[PDB]
């Protein structure tokens, strides 16, 4: 099924996946892809099947041992433990019970209590950044806004020395280029050392603080430490950037909506949820079947890749009436799957929602309107989904 091989990056760059996942959703929501630059695998394409799969982790594992949570798998041939150091264990890629203790030790930084406590500094930062922007001129929003605010946000959380650490997120987050694996492991080396120094420094409220004071994560293997660092870095970086990029693009595509949001900005909390759905910053997550099973009248064999395509689920007509339309006021926006579902569901969702609400808010104080002007580059990927560059002009 070359025709339902949706691991190809063109269709996300060319933004033409819509008809393909619709065919799947109609004829076979679950279906097996026999070969691809990623071997064989199952599409899981409907809303209910993703929620289903994701609610049985003992049976659809997300463990790094089986291969982690992406559509890629480590090797080729590759060199042994002398260079089989590459693969990174991380709690997103851990089964229970290990996952539970690891999540529980970052979770308190994302209590609602702590979002009330973090609102104020975010608002100022957003206000500032947003106030430095040149009305009339054309500039790169990704760079000037979305990277700035998100990697800003990420710095706060770690207690990082104040675009700086976004370097080794675009690095960690290409798996198809043999030649480039060495220079990648290099870069992740750098940050590992850097974050190691930072570890000893704190070791004397940030995620280091909370990780240092946790028996889960105080004694992490070199590999795991790199992997968990990759998680919290990428987790709280790329997804929010791209949502931020997609928002202005989506609204520039759907101005009907923008001028309804302009009229009524009580609709922002929901606007955030409709953009997160529309954009789907991460287009999929992976699981690996743990044993033989019926999934949706399909016989999943033990060990097979199961790809959960949120990007399809977020346009499942069973739940989203007129799905390809951005409907800011859409009353069930909330029930999208851009944060996943179940035990691994985004531990950060609330923080993202803040950043994005606050932005939409002090934007609409300045009565900003963002027009997409110059070049517009989507990320070349089947995993990350959003923009490298998005040039824009203002009201
Ligand atoms: C629009 C913003 C975001 C999106 C779309 C997003 C999406 C996701 C997705 C799809 C997962 C995997 C869920 C699953 O497999 O069931 C996830 C997990 C995670 N996200 Fe996010 N995320 C966002 C923001 C953040 C932020 C701001 C942070 C941290 C600062 C963060 C940290 C994490 C972590 C740590 C995990 C692993 C959680 C676990 O396995 O228990 N994310 N996120």
CSV table of C-alpha atoms and ligand atoms in Angstrom, one decimal:
chain,number,residue,atom,x,y,z
A,1,UNK,CA,0.0,0.0,0.0
A,2,UNK,CA,2.4,2.6,-1.4
A,3,UNK,CA,-0.8,4.7,-1.8
A,4,UNK,CA,-1.5,4.8,2.0
A,5,UNK,CA,2.1,5.2,2.9
A,6,UNK,CA,1.7,8.6,4.7
A,7,UNK,CA,5.3,8.6,6.2
A,8,UNK,CA,6.4,10.6,3.1
A,9,UNK,CA,7.1,14.2,4.1
A,10,UNK,CA,6.0,15.8,0.8
A,11,UNK,CA,2.3,15.5,1.6
A,12,UNK,CA,2.8,17.5,4.8
A,13,UNK,CA,5.0,20.1,3.1
A,14,UNK,CA,2.7,20.2,0.1
A,15,UNK,CA,-0.2,20.2,2.6
A,16,UNK,CA,-2.3,17.6,0.7
A,17,UNK,CA,-2.7,14.8,3.3
A,18,UNK,CA,-6.4,15.7,3.9
A,19,UNK,CA,-7.9,13.6,1.0
A,20,UNK,CA,-5.6,10.6,1.8
A,21,UNK,CA,-6.5,10.3,5.5
A,22,UNK,CA,-10.2,10.8,4.5
A,23,UNK,CA,-10.1,7.8,2.2
A,24,UNK,CA,-8.5,5.8,5.1
A,25,UNK,CA,-11.1,7.0,7.6
A,26,UNK,CA,-13.9,6.0,5.2
A,27,UNK,CA,-12.6,2.6,3.9
A,28,UNK,CA,-10.2,1.2,6.6
A,29,UNK,CA,-9.4,3.4,9.7
A,30,UNK,CA,-6.8,0.7,10.6
A,31,UNK,CA,-4.8,-0.7,7.7
A,32,UNK,CA,-1.3,-2.2,7.2
A,33,UNK,CA,1.5,-0.5,5.2
A,34,UNK,CA,3.8,-3.4,4.0
A,35,UNK,CA,7.0,-1.4,3.4
A,36,UNK,CA,8.3,2.1,3.7
A,37,UNK,CA,11.5,3.8,4.6
A,38,UNK,CA,10.3,2.8,8.1
A,39,UNK,CA,9.4,-0.9,7.4
A,40,UNK,CA,5.9,-2.1,7.8
A,41,UNK,CA,3.4,-0.5,10.2
A,42,UNK,CA,-0.3,0.2,10.9
A,43,UNK,CA,-2.1,3.4,10.3
A,44,UNK,CA,-4.5,4.2,13.1
A,45,UNK,CA,-6.5,7.0,11.6
A,46,UNK,CA,-9.9,7.5,13.4
A,47,UNK,CA,-10.6,9.3,16.6
A,48,UNK,CA,-12.0,6.3,18.6
A,49,UNK,CA,-9.2,3.9,17.6
A,50,UNK,CA,-6.5,6.3,18.8
A,51,UNK,CA,-8.2,6.9,22.1
A,52,UNK,CA,-8.7,3.1,22.3
A,53,UNK,CA,-5.1,2.1,21.6
A,54,UNK,CA,-3.7,4.9,23.8
A,55,UNK,CA,-5.9,3.7,26.7
A,56,UNK,CA,-4.1,0.2,26.7
A,57,UNK,CA,-0.3,0.9,27.1
A,58,UNK,CA,0.5,-2.6,28.5
A,59,UNK,CA,-0.7,-3.9,25.1
A,60,UNK,CA,0.4,-1.0,22.9
A,61,UNK,CA,3.7,-0.2,24.4
A,62,UNK,CA,5.5,3.1,24.1
A,63,UNK,CA,8.8,1.7,25.5
A,64,UNK,CA,12.2,2.7,23.9
A,65,UNK,CA,13.1,-1.0,24.2
A,66,UNK,CA,10.5,-1.8,21.5
A,67,UNK,CA,11.6,1.4,19.6
A,68,UNK,CA,10.2,4.5,21.3
A,69,UNK,CA,7.3,6.7,20.4
A,70,UNK,CA,8.1,7.8,16.8
A,71,UNK,CA,7.7,6.0,13.4
A,72,UNK,CA,11.5,5.6,13.1
A,73,UNK,CA,13.5,2.7,14.6
A,74,UNK,CA,17.2,2.9,15.5
A,75,UNK,CA,19.7,0.9,13.5
A,76,UNK,CA,20.2,-0.2,9.9
A,77,UNK,CA,23.3,-2.3,10.7
A,78,UNK,CA,25.3,0.2,12.9
A,79,UNK,CA,28.1,-0.4,15.4
A,80,UNK,CA,27.7,-2.1,18.8
A,81,UNK,CA,27.7,-0.7,22.4
A,82,UNK,CA,30.8,1.2,21.4
A,83,UNK,CA,28.4,3.3,19.3
A,84,UNK,CA,25.0,1.7,20.2
A,85,UNK,CA,24.9,4.6,22.8
A,86,UNK,CA,22.6,6.5,20.5
A,87,UNK,CA,19.0,5.5,21.5
A,88,UNK,CA,17.6,7.6,24.3
A,89,UNK,CA,15.3,6.3,27.1
A,90,UNK,CA,12.7,8.9,28.3
A,91,UNK,CA,9.5,8.6,30.2
A,92,UNK,CA,7.4,9.4,27.2
A,93,UNK,CA,9.0,6.2,25.9
A,94,UNK,CA,8.5,4.2,29.2
A,95,UNK,CA,5.8,1.7,30.2
A,96,UNK,CA,4.4,1.7,33.7
A,97,UNK,CA,5.4,1.5,36.4
A,98,UNK,CA,8.6,3.5,35.4
A,99,UNK,CA,6.6,6.1,33.5
A,100,UNK,CA,4.3,6.9,36.5
A,101,UNK,CA,7.1,7.9,38.9
A,102,UNK,CA,8.9,9.9,36.2
A,103,UNK,CA,5.8,11.9,35.2
A,104,UNK,CA,4.9,12.5,38.8
A,105,UNK,CA,8.2,14.4,39.3
A,106,UNK,CA,7.7,17.0,36.5
A,107,UNK,CA,3.9,17.3,36.9
A,108,UNK,CA,3.7,19.9,39.8
A,109,UNK,CA,5.3,22.5,37.6
A,110,UNK,CA,2.1,22.3,35.5
A,111,UNK,CA,-0.6,22.3,38.3
A,112,UNK,CA,-3.3,25.1,37.6
A,113,UNK,CA,-2.1,26.7,41.0
A,114,UNK,CA,1.4,27.1,39.3
A,115,UNK,CA,-0.2,28.6,36.1
A,116,UNK,CA,-1.8,31.4,38.2
A,117,UNK,CA,1.7,31.8,39.6
A,118,UNK,CA,3.3,31.9,36.1
A,119,UNK,CA,0.7,34.0,34.2
A,120,UNK,CA,2.1,37.3,35.2
A,121,UNK,CA,5.8,36.8,34.1
A,122,UNK,CA,4.5,35.3,30.8
A,123,UNK,CA,2.2,38.2,30.1
A,124,UNK,CA,5.1,40.8,30.5
A,125,UNK,CA,7.4,38.7,28.3
A,126,UNK,CA,4.7,38.4,25.6
A,127,UNK,CA,3.8,42.1,26.0
A,128,UNK,CA,7.5,43.0,25.6
A,129,UNK,CA,8.4,40.7,22.7
A,130,UNK,CA,5.1,41.6,21.0
A,131,UNK,CA,5.8,45.4,21.5
A,132,UNK,CA,9.2,45.2,19.9
A,133,UNK,CA,7.7,44.3,16.5
A,134,UNK,CA,7.7,46.6,13.5
A,135,UNK,CA,4.2,47.5,12.2
A,136,UNK,CA,4.2,47.9,8.4
A,137,UNK,CA,7.4,45.9,7.7
A,138,UNK,CA,7.6,42.2,6.7
A,139,UNK,CA,9.6,39.9,9.1
A,140,UNK,CA,9.9,36.2,10.1
A,141,UNK,CA,7.2,35.5,12.7
A,142,UNK,CA,8.7,32.1,13.5
A,143,UNK,CA,12.0,33.7,14.5
A,144,UNK,CA,10.7,37.1,15.9
A,145,UNK,CA,7.7,35.8,17.9
A,146,UNK,CA,7.2,32.0,18.1
A,147,UNK,CA,10.8,30.8,18.8
A,148,UNK,CA,11.3,33.9,21.1
A,149,UNK,CA,8.3,33.3,23.4
A,150,UNK,CA,8.6,29.5,23.6
A,151,UNK,CA,12.3,29.1,24.2
A,152,UNK,CA,11.9,32.0,26.5
A,153,UNK,CA,9.2,30.0,28.4
A,154,UNK,CA,11.5,26.9,28.4
A,155,UNK,CA,14.4,28.9,29.9
A,156,UNK,CA,12.2,30.1,32.8
A,157,UNK,CA,11.2,26.4,33.7
A,158,UNK,CA,14.8,25.0,33.8
A,159,UNK,CA,16.4,28.1,35.3
A,160,UNK,CA,18.5,28.4,32.2
A,161,UNK,CA,21.0,31.3,31.5
A,162,UNK,CA,18.9,33.8,29.5
A,163,UNK,CA,17.0,31.9,20.3
A,164,UNK,CA,19.7,30.0,22.3
A,165,UNK,CA,18.8,26.4,23.3
A,166,UNK,CA,16.4,26.0,20.3
A,167,UNK,CA,19.5,24.8,18.5
A,168,UNK,CA,19.5,21.3,20.1
A,169,UNK,CA,15.7,20.9,19.8
A,170,UNK,CA,15.6,21.1,16.0
A,171,UNK,CA,18.6,18.6,16.4
A,172,UNK,CA,16.9,16.1,18.8
A,173,UNK,CA,13.3,16.3,17.3
A,174,UNK,CA,16.6,13.5,9.6
A,175,UNK,CA,16.7,9.9,11.0
A,176,UNK,CA,16.8,9.0,7.2
A,177,UNK,CA,20.3,10.5,6.8
A,178,UNK,CA,22.9,7.9,7.8
A,179,UNK,CA,25.7,10.6,7.2
A,180,UNK,CA,24.3,13.0,9.8
A,181,UNK,CA,23.9,10.7,12.9
A,182,UNK,CA,27.4,11.5,14.2
A,183,UNK,CA,27.1,15.3,14.2
A,184,UNK,CA,23.7,15.0,15.9
A,185,UNK,CA,25.1,12.9,18.8
A,186,UNK,CA,27.8,15.6,18.9
A,187,UNK,CA,25.3,18.4,19.5
A,188,UNK,CA,23.3,16.4,22.1
A,189,UNK,CA,26.7,15.8,23.7
A,190,UNK,CA,27.3,19.5,24.1
A,191,UNK,CA,23.9,20.1,25.8
A,192,UNK,CA,24.4,17.0,28.0
A,193,UNK,CA,27.6,18.5,29.4
A,194,UNK,CA,26.0,21.9,29.7
A,195,UNK,CA,23.0,20.5,31.6
A,196,UNK,CA,25.4,18.4,33.6
A,197,UNK,CA,27.2,21.5,34.8
A,198,UNK,CA,23.7,23.1,35.6
A,199,UNK,CA,23.0,19.8,37.5
A,200,UNK,CA,25.9,20.1,39.9
A,201,UNK,CA,25.2,23.9,40.3
A,202,UNK,CA,21.6,23.2,41.5
A,203,UNK,CA,22.7,20.0,43.3
A,204,UNK,CA,23.9,22.5,46.1
A,205,UNK,CA,11.3,25.1,41.7
A,206,UNK,CA,12.9,24.6,38.2
A,207,UNK,CA,12.6,21.1,36.6
A,208,UNK,CA,16.3,20.5,37.6
A,209,UNK,CA,15.3,21.3,41.2
A,210,UNK,CA,12.4,18.8,40.9
A,211,UNK,CA,14.4,16.2,39.0
A,212,UNK,CA,17.4,16.5,41.5
A,213,UNK,CA,15.0,16.0,44.5
A,214,UNK,CA,13.4,12.9,42.9
A,215,UNK,CA,14.7,9.3,43.4
A,216,UNK,CA,13.1,8.5,40.0
A,217,UNK,CA,15.4,10.9,38.1
A,218,UNK,CA,18.3,11.7,40.5
A,219,UNK,CA,20.3,8.6,39.4
A,220,UNK,CA,19.7,8.5,35.7
A,221,UNK,CA,22.1,6.7,33.4
A,222,UNK,CA,24.1,8.9,30.9
A,223,UNK,CA,21.7,7.9,28.1
A,224,UNK,CA,18.4,8.4,30.1
A,225,UNK,CA,19.6,11.8,31.3
A,226,UNK,CA,20.2,12.9,27.7
A,227,UNK,CA,16.8,11.4,26.7
A,228,UNK,CA,14.8,13.0,29.5
A,229,UNK,CA,16.5,16.3,28.8
A,230,UNK,CA,15.6,15.9,25.1
A,231,UNK,CA,11.9,15.3,26.2
A,232,UNK,CA,11.5,18.4,28.4
A,233,UNK,CA,13.4,20.5,25.9
A,234,UNK,CA,11.6,19.3,22.7
A,235,UNK,CA,8.3,18.8,24.6
A,236,UNK,CA,8.1,22.5,25.7
A,237,UNK,CA,9.7,24.0,22.6
A,238,UNK,CA,8.7,22.9,19.1
A,239,UNK,CA,5.0,22.1,19.7
A,240,UNK,CA,4.3,25.6,21.1
A,241,UNK,CA,6.4,27.4,18.4
A,242,UNK,CA,4.4,25.7,15.6
A,243,UNK,CA,1.0,26.2,17.3
A,244,UNK,CA,2.0,29.9,17.5
A,245,UNK,CA,3.0,29.8,13.8
A,246,UNK,CA,-0.1,27.9,12.7
A,247,UNK,CA,-2.4,30.3,14.6
A,248,UNK,CA,-1.5,33.4,12.5
A,249,UNK,CA,-1.4,31.3,9.3
A,250,UNK,CA,-4.7,29.6,10.1
A,251,UNK,CA,-6.4,32.9,10.9
A,252,UNK,CA,-4.9,34.6,7.8
A,253,UNK,CA,-6.4,31.6,5.9
A,254,UNK,CA,-9.7,32.0,7.7
A,255,UNK,CA,-10.3,35.8,8.2
A,256,UNK,CA,-14.0,35.3,8.6
A,257,UNK,CA,-12.9,33.8,11.9
A,258,UNK,CA,-10.2,36.4,12.7
A,259,UNK,CA,-12.8,39.2,12.5
A,260,UNK,CA,-15.2,37.2,14.7
A,261,UNK,CA,-12.4,36.9,17.2
A,262,UNK,CA,-11.7,40.6,16.8
A,263,UNK,CA,-15.4,41.3,17.5
A,264,UNK,CA,-15.6,38.8,20.4
A,265,UNK,CA,-12.3,38.0,22.3
A,266,UNK,CA,-14.2,36.1,25.1
A,267,UNK,CA,-13.8,33.3,22.5
A,268,UNK,CA,-10.0,33.1,22.9
A,269,UNK,CA,-9.8,30.1,25.3
A,270,UNK,CA,-11.7,28.1,22.7
A,271,UNK,CA,-9.8,29.7,19.8
A,272,UNK,CA,-6.6,28.1,21.3
A,273,UNK,CA,-8.2,24.7,21.3
A,274,UNK,CA,-9.5,25.0,17.7
A,275,UNK,CA,-6.0,26.0,16.5
A,276,UNK,CA,-4.3,23.3,18.4
A,277,UNK,CA,-6.8,20.9,16.8
A,278,UNK,CA,-6.5,22.5,13.3
A,279,UNK,CA,-2.7,22.6,13.4
A,280,UNK,CA,-1.9,19.4,15.2
A,281,UNK,CA,1.7,20.3,15.9
A,282,UNK,CA,2.7,16.7,16.2
A,283,UNK,CA,0.9,14.6,13.5
A,284,UNK,CA,1.5,11.2,15.1
A,285,UNK,CA,2.9,9.2,18.0
A,286,UNK,CA,3.8,5.5,17.8
A,287,UNK,CA,3.1,2.5,19.7
A,288,UNK,CA,4.5,-1.1,19.4
A,289,UNK,CA,2.2,-4.1,19.8
A,290,UNK,CA,3.1,-6.2,22.8
A,291,UNK,CA,1.4,-9.4,21.6
A,292,UNK,CA,-1.2,-10.6,19.0
A,293,UNK,CA,-4.6,-8.8,19.1
A,294,UNK,CA,-7.7,-7.7,17.2
A,295,UNK,CA,-7.7,-3.9,17.0
A,296,UNK,CA,-10.6,-2.9,14.7
A,297,UNK,CA,-11.4,-6.1,12.9
A,298,UNK,CA,-7.7,-6.2,12.1
A,299,UNK,CA,-5.1,-8.8,13.4
A,300,UNK,CA,-2.2,-6.9,14.8
A,301,UNK,CA,0.8,-9.1,15.2
A,302,UNK,CA,3.1,-8.9,18.2
A,303,UNK,CA,5.9,-6.5,17.6
A,304,UNK,CA,4.3,-4.5,14.8
A,305,UNK,CA,4.5,-0.6,14.7
A,306,UNK,CA,1.1,1.0,15.3
A,307,UNK,CA,1.1,4.7,14.2
A,308,UNK,CA,-1.4,6.9,15.9
A,309,UNK,CA,-2.1,9.7,13.3
A,310,UNK,CA,-3.6,12.5,15.4
A,311,UNK,CA,-3.5,14.6,12.3
A,312,UNK,CA,-6.3,12.4,10.8
A,313,UNK,CA,-8.2,12.0,14.1
A,314,UNK,CA,-8.4,15.8,14.5
A,315,UNK,CA,-10.5,15.8,11.2
A,316,UNK,CA,-12.7,12.8,12.1
A,317,UNK,CA,-16.2,13.8,11.0
A,318,UNK,CA,-17.6,11.4,13.6
A,319,UNK,CA,-16.6,14.2,16.1
A,320,UNK,CA,-15.7,17.3,14.1
A,321,UNK,CA,-18.6,18.5,11.8
A,322,UNK,CA,-17.1,20.4,8.8
A,323,UNK,CA,-13.7,19.5,10.0
A,324,UNK,CA,-11.3,21.3,7.5
A,325,UNK,CA,-13.0,24.6,8.5
A,326,UNK,CA,-11.4,26.6,11.3
A,327,UNK,CA,-14.4,27.3,13.5
A,328,UNK,CA,-13.0,29.3,16.5
A,329,UNK,CA,-16.3,29.0,18.3
A,330,UNK,CA,-16.6,25.3,17.6
A,331,UNK,CA,-18.3,23.9,20.8
A,332,UNK,CA,-16.3,20.6,21.1
A,333,UNK,CA,-12.9,22.0,20.0
A,334,UNK,CA,-11.6,20.6,23.4
A,335,UNK,CA,-12.0,17.0,22.3
A,336,UNK,CA,-9.1,17.1,19.8
A,337,UNK,CA,-6.1,14.7,20.3
A,338,UNK,CA,-3.1,17.1,19.6
A,339,UNK,CA,-1.9,16.3,23.2
A,340,UNK,CA,-2.7,12.6,22.9
A,341,UNK,CA,-4.9,10.8,25.4
A,342,UNK,CA,-4.6,8.6,28.5
A,343,UNK,CA,-1.7,8.2,30.9
A,344,UNK,CA,0.9,9.8,28.6
A,345,UNK,CA,-1.4,12.8,27.7
A,346,UNK,CA,0.6,16.0,27.4
A,347,UNK,CA,1.8,16.9,30.9
A,348,UNK,CA,2.3,20.5,29.5
A,349,UNK,CA,-1.1,21.1,27.8
A,350,UNK,CA,-2.0,23.7,30.4
A,351,UNK,CA,1.2,25.6,30.0
A,352,UNK,CA,0.9,25.6,26.3
A,353,UNK,CA,-2.7,26.9,26.6
A,354,UNK,CA,-1.5,29.7,28.8
A,355,UNK,CA,1.4,30.9,26.5
A,356,UNK,CA,-1.1,30.8,23.5
A,357,UNK,CA,-4.1,32.4,25.4
A,358,UNK,CA,-1.8,35.2,26.7
A,359,UNK,CA,-0.4,35.8,23.3
A,360,UNK,CA,-3.8,35.9,21.6
A,361,UNK,CA,-4.8,38.3,24.4
A,362,UNK,CA,-2.1,41.1,24.4
A,363,UNK,CA,-2.2,40.8,20.6
A,364,UNK,CA,-5.9,41.8,20.6
A,365,UNK,CA,-5.1,44.7,23.1
A,366,UNK,CA,-2.8,46.1,20.4
A,367,UNK,CA,-5.6,45.3,17.8
A,368,UNK,CA,-2.9,43.5,15.8
A,369,UNK,CA,-3.8,41.7,12.5
A,370,UNK,CA,-1.1,39.5,11.1
A,371,UNK,CA,-1.0,39.2,7.3
A,372,UNK,CA,1.1,36.4,5.9
A,373,UNK,CA,3.4,38.2,3.4
A,374,UNK,CA,6.7,36.6,2.2
A,375,UNK,CA,8.0,33.0,2.1
A,376,UNK,CA,6.2,30.3,4.1
A,377,UNK,CA,8.2,27.1,4.9
A,378,UNK,CA,6.5,24.1,6.5
A,379,UNK,CA,8.7,21.6,8.4
A,380,UNK,CA,9.8,18.6,6.2
A,381,UNK,CA,8.6,15.8,8.4
A,382,UNK,CA,5.9,13.2,9.2
A,383,UNK,CA,6.3,13.8,13.0
A,384,UNK,CA,6.8,17.5,13.6
A,385,UNK,CA,4.1,19.5,11.8
A,386,UNK,CA,4.4,23.3,11.4
A,387,UNK,CA,6.7,26.0,10.1
A,388,UNK,CA,10.4,26.7,9.7
A,389,UNK,CA,9.7,30.3,8.5
A,390,UNK,CA,6.5,32.4,8.0
A,391,UNK,CA,7.0,36.1,6.9
A,392,UNK,CA,4.3,38.5,8.0
A,393,UNK,CA,3.1,42.2,8.1
A,394,UNK,CA,0.8,43.9,10.7
A,395,UNK,CA,-2.5,45.9,10.9
B,1,LIG,C1,0.7,22.7,21.8
B,1,LIG,C2,1.6,22.3,22.7
B,1,LIG,C3,1.9,20.8,22.9
B,1,LIG,C4,1.5,19.7,22.2
B,1,LIG,C5,0.7,19.6,21.0
B,1,LIG,C6,2.0,18.6,22.9
B,1,LIG,C7,1.8,17.3,22.4
B,1,LIG,C8,2.2,16.2,23.1
B,1,LIG,C9,1.9,14.9,22.7
B,1,LIG,C10,1.2,14.5,21.5
B,1,LIG,C11,2.5,14.1,23.7
B,1,LIG,C12,2.4,12.6,23.7
B,1,LIG,C13,1.1,12.2,24.3
B,1,LIG,C14,0.9,10.7,24.1
B,1,LIG,O1,1.7,10.0,23.4
B,1,LIG,O2,-0.2,10.2,24.5
B,1,LIG,C15,3.0,14.9,24.7
B,1,LIG,C16,3.7,14.5,25.8
B,1,LIG,C17,4.5,15.3,26.5
B,1,LIG,N1,4.5,16.6,26.5
B,1,LIG,FE1,3.6,17.7,25.2
B,1,LIG,N2,2.7,19.0,23.9
B,1,LIG,C18,2.7,20.3,24.0
B,1,LIG,C19,3.2,21.2,25.0
B,1,LIG,C20,4.1,20.7,25.9
B,1,LIG,C21,4.8,21.5,26.9
B,1,LIG,C22,4.7,23.1,27.0
B,1,LIG,C23,5.5,20.7,27.7
B,1,LIG,C24,6.5,21.0,28.8
B,1,LIG,C25,7.0,22.2,29.1
B,1,LIG,C26,5.3,19.4,27.2
B,1,LIG,C27,5.8,18.3,27.7
B,1,LIG,C28,5.4,17.0,27.4
B,1,LIG,C29,5.9,15.9,28.1
B,1,LIG,C30,6.9,16.0,29.3
B,1,LIG,C31,5.3,14.8,27.6
B,1,LIG,C32,5.5,13.4,28.0
B,1,LIG,C33,4.3,13.2,29.0
B,1,LIG,C34,4.1,11.7,29.4
B,1,LIG,O3,4.5,10.8,28.6
B,1,LIG,O4,3.7,11.5,30.6
B,1,LIG,N3,4.4,19.4,26.1
B,1,LIG,N4,2.8,16.2,24.3
